[PDB]
Amino acid sequence: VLSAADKSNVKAAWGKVGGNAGAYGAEALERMFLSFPTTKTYFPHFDLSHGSAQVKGHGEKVAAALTKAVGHLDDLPGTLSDLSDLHAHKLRVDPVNFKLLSHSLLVTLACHLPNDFTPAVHASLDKFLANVSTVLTSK
């Protein structure tokens, strides 16, 4: 909730994530979907099988939304205002979903970046992802 050493660890991990962001998101989601199928039901009218144009394309967005987040780290309220709005009021995503997506990022970050994925960066990223999750289910 979160330390200075956290903001850092985040902006340190996600730099390494780099021009790949797009994909990792795509893979967080994919991995969120075979792993926690009751997640699937938030995307009814949505191609939801391996390698999909949507599964991809939507990832770009999810990932581009943490990219903004990392960037605006200091007031996650005011950067994510439109996304709570969307996940809170309109779509009413059940806070527990924010948190198995959050672990499919971590899992996802983990195999790709073994040497950048230290406990200390793990630590901060749960906190990060835990907190994005909290803004997004707000007001």
Binding site: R31, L34, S104, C111, T118, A120, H122, A123
Partner: protein, 142 residues
């Protein structure tokens, strides 16, 4: 889960570095979820991340839990029976309430993708996601 999977899960599990996988999983937990620390506060120096990662009982406990995590890979049906004795310690003498097992089931799976990279297929998470579910519940029985 149906043998088709009890034996795509065993295939991976045979390839896992069991000694160090447990050590590392148990460190990340204590590190990532800093409160779990107080059940292992008698393990000594949990005073920071390298201290945890390099504290020898964190190491040994890692083993024994991750080996407890093998016996279950054997008896994937009576994961109740297997983990009756450790649900005993955990809920009754140790009181650890069962959100914290899930946590460690998950931290184990974060770890697996660290050691095995792209081989830890999106479809092989889910598999293990189940095992780490049941095993979270096995313990949570009492």
């Amino acid at each position: 889960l149906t043998a088709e999977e009890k034996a795509a899960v065993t295939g991976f599990w045979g390839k896992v570095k069991v000694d160090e996988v447990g050590a590392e999983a148990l460190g990340r937990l204590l590190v990532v979820y800093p409160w779990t620390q107080r059940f292992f506060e008698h393990f000594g120096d949990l005073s920071s991340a390298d201290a945890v990662m390099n504290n020898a009982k964190v190491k040994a406990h890692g083993k024994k839990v991750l080996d407890s995590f093998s016996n279950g890979m054997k008896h994937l049906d009576d994961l109740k029976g297997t983990f009756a004795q450790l649900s005993e310690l955990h809920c009754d003498k140790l009181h650890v309430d069962p959100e914290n097992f899930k946590l460690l089931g998950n931290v184990l799976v974060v770890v697996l993708a660290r050691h095995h990279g792209s081989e830890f297929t999106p479809l092989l998470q889910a598999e293990f996601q189940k095992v780490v579910a049941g095993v979270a519940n096995a313990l949570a029985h009492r």
